[PDB]
Design a protein around this ligand. Structure first.
Ligand SMILES: CCOC(=O)CNC(=O)NCc1ccnc(N)c1
Ligand SMILES: [K+]
Ligand SMILES: [K+]
Length: 164
Protein backbone atom coordinates (compact mmCIF):
# COMPACT_ATOMS: atom_id res chain seq x y z
CA UNK A 1 0.00 0.00 0.00
CA UNK A 2 0.90 3.70 0.15
CA UNK A 3 3.59 4.49 2.63
CA UNK A 4 2.64 5.82 6.05
CA UNK A 5 5.42 8.01 7.46
CA UNK A 6 5.93 10.27 10.50
CA UNK A 7 7.59 13.46 11.63
CA UNK A 8 8.16 14.05 15.37
CA UNK A 9 8.43 17.85 15.75
CA UNK A 10 9.73 20.04 18.62
CA UNK A 11 9.78 23.78 19.32
CA UNK A 12 12.99 24.93 21.01
CA UNK A 13 13.50 21.39 22.14
CA UNK A 14 10.08 20.82 23.55
CA UNK A 15 7.96 18.06 21.76
CA UNK A 16 4.85 19.14 19.92
CA UNK A 17 3.88 15.64 18.89
CA UNK A 18 3.73 13.51 15.75
CA UNK A 19 2.51 14.24 12.24
CA UNK A 20 1.52 11.10 10.30
CA UNK A 21 1.43 11.35 6.56
CA UNK A 22 0.14 9.14 3.75
CA UNK A 23 2.30 9.26 0.62
CA UNK A 24 0.31 8.72 -2.62
CA UNK A 25 2.74 6.28 -4.29
CA UNK A 26 -0.19 5.03 -6.26
CA UNK A 27 -0.44 8.42 -8.08
CA UNK A 28 3.14 9.92 -7.79
CA UNK A 29 5.48 7.08 -7.13
CA UNK A 30 8.72 8.89 -7.72
CA UNK A 31 7.73 11.91 -5.53
CA UNK A 32 6.38 9.65 -2.80
CA UNK A 33 9.51 7.53 -2.82
CA UNK A 34 11.75 10.60 -2.48
CA UNK A 35 9.89 11.77 0.61
CA UNK A 36 9.65 8.24 2.12
CA UNK A 37 13.42 7.75 1.83
CA UNK A 38 14.19 11.22 3.21
CA UNK A 39 12.07 10.32 6.30
CA UNK A 40 13.86 7.01 6.91
CA UNK A 41 17.31 8.45 6.20
CA UNK A 42 18.18 5.21 4.34
CA UNK A 43 20.25 7.02 1.63
CA UNK A 44 22.49 8.63 4.32
CA UNK A 45 20.72 11.98 4.38
CA UNK A 46 17.23 13.31 5.04
CA UNK A 47 14.91 15.25 7.24
CA UNK A 48 15.97 14.18 10.76
CA UNK A 49 17.43 17.23 12.61
CA UNK A 50 16.21 19.78 10.04
CA UNK A 51 13.68 22.61 10.51
CA UNK A 52 10.40 24.15 9.50
CA UNK A 53 12.04 27.33 8.11
CA UNK A 54 8.93 29.07 6.70
CA UNK A 55 5.66 29.04 8.50
CA UNK A 56 2.85 31.39 7.42
CA UNK A 57 -0.34 31.28 9.48
CA UNK A 58 -3.45 30.69 7.41
CA UNK A 59 -1.40 29.33 4.57
CA UNK A 60 1.23 26.57 5.11
CA UNK A 61 4.13 25.19 7.04
CA UNK A 62 7.30 24.66 4.94
CA UNK A 63 10.29 22.43 5.68
CA UNK A 64 12.88 20.11 4.19
CA UNK A 65 15.90 22.36 3.50
CA UNK A 66 18.30 20.10 5.32
CA UNK A 67 21.38 21.61 3.56
CA UNK A 68 21.04 25.37 4.17
CA UNK A 69 18.25 25.52 6.72
CA UNK A 70 16.78 28.58 5.06
CA UNK A 71 14.73 27.80 1.98
CA UNK A 72 17.54 27.94 -0.53
CA UNK A 73 18.60 24.34 -0.50
CA UNK A 74 17.81 20.63 -0.12
CA UNK A 75 18.32 17.74 -2.53
CA UNK A 76 16.44 14.67 -3.58
CA UNK A 77 17.40 11.04 -3.40
CA UNK A 78 17.82 11.19 -7.21
CA UNK A 79 20.14 14.19 -7.46
CA UNK A 80 19.76 17.84 -6.80
CA UNK A 81 16.40 18.27 -8.55
CA UNK A 82 13.84 16.12 -10.23
CA UNK A 83 11.00 16.72 -12.62
CA UNK A 84 7.38 17.50 -11.84
CA UNK A 85 5.84 14.05 -11.83
CA UNK A 86 2.25 15.03 -12.54
CA UNK A 87 -0.34 17.44 -11.21
CA UNK A 88 -3.13 14.90 -10.74
CA UNK A 89 -3.64 15.57 -7.02
CA UNK A 90 -4.91 19.01 -6.06
CA UNK A 91 -4.54 21.40 -3.15
CA UNK A 92 -8.00 20.65 -1.79
CA UNK A 93 -7.75 21.84 1.81
CA UNK A 94 -5.80 21.79 4.98
CA UNK A 95 -3.40 18.85 5.54
CA UNK A 96 -2.37 18.54 1.88
CA UNK A 97 1.32 17.58 1.53
CA UNK A 98 2.96 19.19 -1.54
CA UNK A 99 6.42 19.89 -2.97
CA UNK A 100 7.99 23.34 -2.69
CA UNK A 101 9.84 24.49 -5.78
CA UNK A 102 11.76 27.29 -7.53
CA UNK A 103 9.84 26.89 -10.78
CA UNK A 104 9.02 24.03 -13.14
CA UNK A 105 10.99 20.85 -12.67
CA UNK A 106 12.86 21.95 -9.52
CA UNK A 107 11.67 19.48 -6.89
CA UNK A 108 14.23 18.64 -4.30
CA UNK A 109 13.50 17.94 -0.64
CA UNK A 110 11.56 21.00 0.41
CA UNK A 111 7.90 20.46 1.09
CA UNK A 112 4.86 22.02 2.70
CA UNK A 113 1.79 21.03 4.72
CA UNK A 114 -1.18 23.23 3.95
CA UNK A 115 -3.26 24.81 6.74
CA UNK A 116 -5.86 26.11 4.29
CA UNK A 117 -7.01 25.21 0.79
CA UNK A 118 -4.18 26.43 -1.53
CA UNK A 119 -5.88 25.86 -4.92
CA UNK A 120 -3.92 28.66 -6.58
CA UNK A 121 -0.96 26.21 -6.47
CA UNK A 122 -2.71 23.58 -8.55
CA UNK A 123 -0.67 22.61 -11.63
CA UNK A 124 2.37 24.41 -10.15
CA UNK A 125 3.24 22.28 -7.11
CA UNK A 126 3.15 18.48 -7.05
CA UNK A 127 0.82 17.26 -4.34
CA UNK A 128 1.87 13.84 -3.05
CA UNK A 129 0.18 13.08 0.24
CA UNK A 130 -1.83 14.25 3.19
CA UNK A 131 -2.03 14.28 6.95
CA UNK A 132 -3.55 11.13 8.46
CA UNK A 133 -3.01 12.12 12.11
CA UNK A 134 -1.62 15.15 13.95
CA UNK A 135 -3.30 18.07 12.22
CA UNK A 136 -3.33 19.46 15.78
CA UNK A 137 0.44 19.22 15.75
CA UNK A 138 0.51 21.06 12.41
CA UNK A 139 -1.66 23.75 13.98
CA UNK A 140 0.87 24.08 16.82
CA UNK A 141 3.71 24.52 14.32
CA UNK A 142 1.52 27.13 12.49
CA UNK A 143 1.11 28.99 15.81
CA UNK A 144 4.85 29.70 15.91
CA UNK A 145 4.96 31.23 12.40
CA UNK A 146 4.28 34.72 11.23
CA UNK A 147 3.12 36.57 8.21
CA UNK A 148 6.78 37.01 7.17
CA UNK A 149 7.23 33.22 7.45
CA UNK A 150 9.77 33.61 10.25
CA UNK A 151 9.23 31.42 13.23
CA UNK A 152 9.33 32.68 16.79
CA UNK A 153 10.80 29.39 18.08
CA UNK A 154 13.16 26.95 16.37
CA UNK A 155 10.87 24.19 14.91
CA UNK A 156 12.84 20.92 14.40
CA UNK A 157 11.96 17.54 12.98
CA UNK A 158 13.60 15.60 15.81
CA UNK A 159 12.80 12.23 14.35
CA UNK A 160 11.14 10.79 11.32
CA UNK A 161 10.50 7.45 9.65
CA UNK A 162 8.15 4.97 8.11
CA UNK A 163 5.30 3.13 9.94
CA UNK A 164 4.11 0.91 7.08
C1 LIG B 1 4.06 27.11 -0.60
C2 LIG B 1 5.23 26.59 -1.37
O1 LIG B 1 6.08 27.73 -1.64
C3 LIG B 1 7.24 27.61 -2.39
O2 LIG B 1 7.55 26.55 -2.90
C4 LIG B 1 7.92 28.94 -2.63
N1 LIG B 1 9.21 28.67 -3.17
C5 LIG B 1 10.25 28.41 -2.41
O3 LIG B 1 10.18 28.45 -1.19
N2 LIG B 1 11.33 28.11 -3.10
C6 LIG B 1 12.60 27.84 -2.53
C7 LIG B 1 13.10 26.51 -2.95
C8 LIG B 1 12.25 25.40 -3.12
C9 LIG B 1 12.75 24.16 -3.50
N3 LIG B 1 14.04 23.98 -3.70
C10 LIG B 1 14.91 25.06 -3.56
N4 LIG B 1 16.33 24.82 -3.77
C11 LIG B 1 14.44 26.31 -3.16
K1 LIG C 1 -0.91 36.09 1.50
K1 LIG D 1 13.58 7.08 12.85
Amino acid sequence: GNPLVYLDVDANGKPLGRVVLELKADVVPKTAENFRALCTGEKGFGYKGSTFHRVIPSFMCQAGDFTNHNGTGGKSIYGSRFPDENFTLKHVGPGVLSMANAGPNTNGSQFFICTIKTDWLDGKHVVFGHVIEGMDVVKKIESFGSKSGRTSKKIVITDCGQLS
